[PDB]
Design a protein around this nucleic acid. Sequence first.
DNA 1: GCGTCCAGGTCTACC
DNA 2: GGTAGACCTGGACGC
Length: 314
Amino acid sequence: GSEGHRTLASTPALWASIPCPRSELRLDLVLPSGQSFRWREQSPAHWSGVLADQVWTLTQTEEQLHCTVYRSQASRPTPDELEAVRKYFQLDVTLAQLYHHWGSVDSHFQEVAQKFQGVRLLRQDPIECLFSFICSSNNNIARITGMVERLCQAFGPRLIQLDDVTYHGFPSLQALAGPEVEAHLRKLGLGYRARYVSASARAILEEQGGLAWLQQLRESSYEEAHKALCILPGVGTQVADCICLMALDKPQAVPVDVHMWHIAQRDYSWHPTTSQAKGPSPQTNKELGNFFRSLWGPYAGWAQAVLFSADLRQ
DNA sequence: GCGTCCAGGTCTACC
DNA sequence: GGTAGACCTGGACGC
Ligand SMILES: [Ca+2]
């Protein structure tokens, strides 16, 4: 009863709600879609993970988002803590207004948007976002998820345990920059990305001026930010865009991976015009990004998140 | 069963 | 400057 992952029906007095209609948010379409790799549906329709340095379980009804926190006597989430959740899901942004606009200027989006409502963008921590996506290149979401979990268990702060799952906070720069981290990560199956994680932690700490350098990027311009990130090992045009869009508040950033290329080709009959090659290249990828930006506008990256999520369901 | 594919790409030797 | 290839892993086919 007081053990294991909570459920809305099993410990009612431990949940607090936040007004939020399904049309504004669909947990099942956001949490496992490759934005954040730290959420698990431990129980049907209930997603658990670390949010703002503590564990949470989230589940929704038709007009409500139910939340519960595991911190020392058990109690319902406080208003201050609930605000942590609203900020994570950027709930002040009305998804209905965005869908309307995108739908109005792109009939294909309108068709897809009718079946995939509630796909919004999470506002993530720069450090977690940087290393999680460094782990995502040339990989699949299922594998990435495992790697990130083993990376946190091995180098992140131990939080609390529910059933047989021990939650860990995301590793710090100092820890990822530690001795023999690469070798450890390789044994944890991160492949060549193990070097990228170690190498990027050190560059940030020993060459770019630590954490402050990364955090300052949120006030910098998309152009500047993306430019700054490409310096880090394991970070290319796509990873940089992922971070700008999901962790640095650059809503116009559009990541271009294999999924978005296929979408461009079959759903818009798109082809490079300024670019030389007829396939993916640093030049064509950059062009595809501008194409999407001129199609959807300022929040083009968010529209991208919708089609990407929808393309995963196939 | 085994070899080839691929997945939210990067990085590098080279024409 | 604008490419071809190599690359850790492991669930997916194709045969
Ligand atoms: Ca590929």
